From a paper:
In about 60-70% of newly synthesized proteins, the initiator methionine is removed by a metalloenzyme called methionine aminopeptidase (MetAPs). Type Ia MetAP is the isoform with minimum sequence and structure required for the catalysis and is present in all prokaryotes. MetAPs have strict substrate specificity towards peptides with methionine on the amino-terminus. Here, we report the discovery of a novel MetAP1a found predominantly in the streptococci bacteria with two new structural motifs one of which may undergo posttranslational modification of glycosylation and phosphorylation.
To further understand the relationship of the two inserts with respect to catalytic domain, crystal structure of the SpMetAP1a is determined at 3.2 Å in the P65 space group with two molecules in the asymmetric unit. The overall structure is similar to that of the E. coli MetAP1a (EcMetAP1a) adopting the pita-bread fold. Since the crystals were grown in the absence of metal salts, the active site is devoid of any metal ions. The metal binding residues are well ordered and interact with each other as was noticed in the human MetAP1b apo structure. Although the overall structure of SpMetAP1a is similar to other MetAP structures in the catalytic domain, there is important difference near the active site. Not withstanding the confirmation of the extra loops (discussed below), a β-hairpin198-211 (equivalent region in EcMetAP1a is 170-183) undergoes a conformational change and occupies the active site where the substrate methionine usually binds. In the new conformation, the metal binding H199 moves away from the active site when compared to analogous residue (H171) in EcMetAP1a. Due to this flip of the β-hairpin, residues in the loop region are forced to occupy the substrate-binding region. Hence, substrate cannot bind to the enzyme in this conformation. The insert region (103Gly–Gly132) forms the extension of the loop within a beta-hairpin. The tyrosine kinase phosphorylation motif (124KKYT) is also well ordered and structurally placed closed to the glycosylation motif.
Author numbering:
A (entry chain B): 1 to 198, 208 to 286
B (entry chain A): 1 to 286
Amino acid sequence: MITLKSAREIEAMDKAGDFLASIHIGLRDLIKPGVDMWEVEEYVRRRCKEENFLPLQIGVDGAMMDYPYATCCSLNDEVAHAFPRHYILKDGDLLKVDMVLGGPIAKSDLNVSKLNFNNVEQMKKYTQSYSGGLADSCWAYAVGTPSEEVKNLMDITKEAMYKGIEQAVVGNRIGDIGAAIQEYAESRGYGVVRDLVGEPMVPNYGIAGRGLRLREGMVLTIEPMINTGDWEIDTDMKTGWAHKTIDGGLSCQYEHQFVITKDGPVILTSQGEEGTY
Amino acid sequence: MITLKSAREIEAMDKAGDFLASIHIGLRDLIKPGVDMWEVEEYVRRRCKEENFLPLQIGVDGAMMDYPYATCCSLNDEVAHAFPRHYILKDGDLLKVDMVLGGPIAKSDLNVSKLNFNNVEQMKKYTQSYSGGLADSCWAYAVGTPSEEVKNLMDITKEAMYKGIEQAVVGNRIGDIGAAIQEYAESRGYGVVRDLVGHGVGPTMHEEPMVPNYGIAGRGLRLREGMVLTIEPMINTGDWEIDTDMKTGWAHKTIDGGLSCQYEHQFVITKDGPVILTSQGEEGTY
């Protein structure tokens, strides 16, 4: 939804962005060679129960089925929306952890959840009835030590993302972002995903000076999906969720949420110093 | 903005779409071989004056320059946002006419405006101010008798769009629409454009939502009753890649020199299904 947010709904979000940010920070100490990808789900699982946040990915619809996990764990050639699973990570692996968390909410009647060991394992929609403030935010991680293949892939996806941001300046068109993102990644061989066309969201591609003019108070998210070479994407036939690349290439993806603001864009989902993680 | 609406707010658009449709029908007679394309503008200009309807595309902001015309007269291998101009229409040319018009609007000083002469050649930005309700809708035209290559191009886009509409039923997602649009055209090795959704087409516009003509059958807003959306497939023979004019910064053109075509409607998400707000007949027939 495009219509602007009042400063409290903004504040709301930075605090969920605070939280989100911290899971990502806990994750560094955990995404390593030999560990069961599944520890990722459990960590967010665990940390949601401790500080009373909702994993709002649990219960969302699908042609096939609703989304079972709190987390999406897209590994390597998996682009996005893959599941977390029993899998021992490897040195060299590239792993992406998207999630959307809502809170922090207190506790009370059949309205305000205590939210502990209700069965995160099962198909309850307190979730689709929204938890006030939230944040999607995917962040990528090289498990162990990465090929140059990877290191490079990741840097571009990253700077690409932050270059989009750079253009998120008041009095300017969304066109000017996707444009920017497009150019950067695309001017190095890397192909950008289009088939997912990314609460509102900006696409990673477009003709510059050719979109919605940006206002103060809009909160947007930038979610670059870049591939080695080629950009076409599958949709898991069996679950209608996971997306792998088509040419076998790798895909990376970084993602924040910001506010348009005289003085320029301001990030809510920041894990500290930008470009240093 | 991608929210819901009012009930009379819906109304305004149908009434504002009643008018744009009428133009489009008017044009059927107009668009013959031997006719100067510029007529399409002057005509539209003309009818915009006779009822108070502002042509909102004039003054919409842009880089190299603001859009200066009531219409876009895209032509053959031009896919979108090309100017009307003096071109004398060869038999077999494929011409796509896009417009945005707001109103109708009553008259006078500080209570609703008069519109005979603003000089429609000026820096006339009343246009950039919610000018009541309105309607965007491109439509495609064959000048004279159209090749087989063209006949199909026009027919496949026309249908693909209506196939999109079919999906716009309360409780589907936007994905479902764009997917099925994508599929239909792509199944005859037609190309579908992606490089521009102006995501929300605030280009040649102000604010209104835009479903994209490609996607996955999940990845978008589940669509509730009361949403009003436009839909507009640019299709190409062959390549979906697109120019953008360097001199003026508007006109988009197929990369390989193929032909492109575009149709467009808007509609409300009612609970009978979707009710098309910009109709100029019974559907499939025009």
